[PDB]
Amino acid sequence: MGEVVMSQAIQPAHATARGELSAGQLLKWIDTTACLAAEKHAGVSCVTASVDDIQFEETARVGQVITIKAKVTRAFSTSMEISIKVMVQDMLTGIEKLVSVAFSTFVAKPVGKEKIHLKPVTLLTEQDHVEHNLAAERRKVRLQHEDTRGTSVQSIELVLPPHANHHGNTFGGQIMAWMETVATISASRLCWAHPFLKSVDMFKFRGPSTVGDRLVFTAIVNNTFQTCVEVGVRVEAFDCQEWAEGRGRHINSAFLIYNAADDKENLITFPRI
């Protein structure tokens, strides 16, 4: 019913040192599902234009099953809004818990110089009309949002073919995964404990990336508050030539909020800064 459904069993390969699902991996999965919904509407390849605020109510563990459902709520001109629901199920108890509810914005790409005009989302249920109207306000918010200490972390990732679509365009989800890895390192470096992602703030993907180009990641704590730490990550891009000349492209800047727990499952308080 307009939904794209992905199901993933959580393996050690998706895990952190604690037997928990890497938040970056989950973000990758989410972006993939959403992108598939978008492309299912568009009929052409789509890329992650932006992401709204994402909060995680639960942290999934190895052995559990993640279910991700994405849907196109509304098409505009070249962009569209995707609603995402993430559920976790324990396979010993049978219990389902909501992990996340979020929105992401995807943009349809032409092959060449094709203009692109998206057909409208067909509406049936009343809730379809409701979400169809809310999509406009949420979009307005998204657009207006573009009104815009030595424990730093630096990292670098080379963009290979499995990190982009078949046209060569880097996945926003991969970037989000790498981002999350680096940020987590920063948080850990502040608390010397075990950080788990509480949320990611809304941000835009400002420019495209391509296979073969370098992504420099710069993470640093921006603020702290009781049990929450905020890490800001910057993603800058260079093709080989740009890499040689030091002139990069600001791909994106995001803010990730973490909690943390020690080597016992008890929560901890971050120092003030």
Added chain:
Amino acid sequence: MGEVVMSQAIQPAHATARGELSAGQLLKWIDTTACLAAEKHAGVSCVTASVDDIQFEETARVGQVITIKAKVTRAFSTSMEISIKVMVQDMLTGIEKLVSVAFSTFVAKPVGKEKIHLKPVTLLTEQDHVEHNLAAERRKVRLQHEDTRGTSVQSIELVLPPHANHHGNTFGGQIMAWMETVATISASRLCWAHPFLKSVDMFKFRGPSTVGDRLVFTAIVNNTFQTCVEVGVRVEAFDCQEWAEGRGRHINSAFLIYNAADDKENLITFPRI
């Protein structure tokens, strides 16, 4: 001696939540080895045409070493039959156990409009002639075989470059791996325990897949019997356009038989359906 040998140490990255080798990973490895044997005979790229019945006598664990040997038993016109032997060795005891003995059929692909004629397999030992004759009967069987409850699982995989050969053709082994993941989720969802793969029934790859296209996987228990559960998986393919229009290609349908164990190493009985 016509054999292709692969050796793989089993790491957490190849593991399930139980420290056992993912059956899908093993299937990937098997298909790869077999394909390498086939291409070693053909001199051109080959794809997985079909797979005979595969039974697993053992389940390998993290720390153990898998050895896979493949061989071309007989070439026909464009296809050939590959015999596969899978052994596991424990690296603390030195003990080897047979994991599997199976056959797979591979088809040589031309580059363009080239006709393809395969040279015969050279025969030395008598057992080479024996298997060369048996290959005909086994083939006859393969060809004749094409005479052809709410715990469902749905999943989706985007086919990226590491999932296909350099011409863009999706590996049958990758499809088998994904299949296995989804199916395992279904079985778990029936028993709420820990399923391990007992076997896979013979099936054909009905059509090609290509980088960039979506594979929709649909798993559902078809039957049960004492300690065995049967999960059927369907694999449907869509390029982006087909994805938009809902017209897919039936790539394949397979049937996987599992057992299961609880959080103790004791076997369990599945309910009747």
Added chain:
Amino acid sequence: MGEVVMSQAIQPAHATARGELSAGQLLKWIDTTACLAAEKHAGVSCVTASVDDIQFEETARVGQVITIKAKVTRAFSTSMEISIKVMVQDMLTGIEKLVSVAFSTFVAKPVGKEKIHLKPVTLLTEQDHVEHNLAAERRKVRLQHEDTRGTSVQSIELVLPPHANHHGNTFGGQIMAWMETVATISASRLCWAHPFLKSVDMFKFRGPSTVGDRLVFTAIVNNTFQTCVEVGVRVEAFDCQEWAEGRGRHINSAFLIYNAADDKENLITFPRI
């Protein structure tokens, strides 16, 4: 300051059966960082020409963070020398330990028939001049170095797009990773315990490899001495046609020295051979 910095948290996906970082993975990371430094100097794609001796003072564990820093010490004509420093940090204690200090030689590749002339490394500090001079001697040594029992291991790897750069050239680091896997299997097969990499001897990458070609790996113990075992690995390459005809290309031959520990953290002595 001419440095390229990569930071990697160590996950189960990077781990062995013992919760330690795979040496091959570390080698991959090292080669990547170094290559990025090289390309940052050259402005074009670079490949691993050779590697000096690498010794590992520590073995990192899951949960710890690897930091790798690479730098171009000196450019010659088409080649350049890269100095690499590998540090590990425990994220519970905050303690850093040096893992490695090594040198690698990278070669700039033209796109077509372009001649390639590298600009000199700018020198500031005195240590920059010192290393700039030492680079010549170390190079002289590298060039002169090209003056050149049944527990064998054989394995095979198909080179896919994630294993090469965007021009199709296989990464030396991937080859080093595969090498290490196979070698480790050999060592384990000698001691029936848990080998960890002590060092790798300097070796040259004699020829290029390309996406789609097979890498046959042959590992075998060459010698033993008290607590050290030496495993030699050979890497031979075949495109599909070459694969069919049995005429390969000797890509490289390396020698890896291991120690080992039993299922207690106590070191062990290898038998004489």
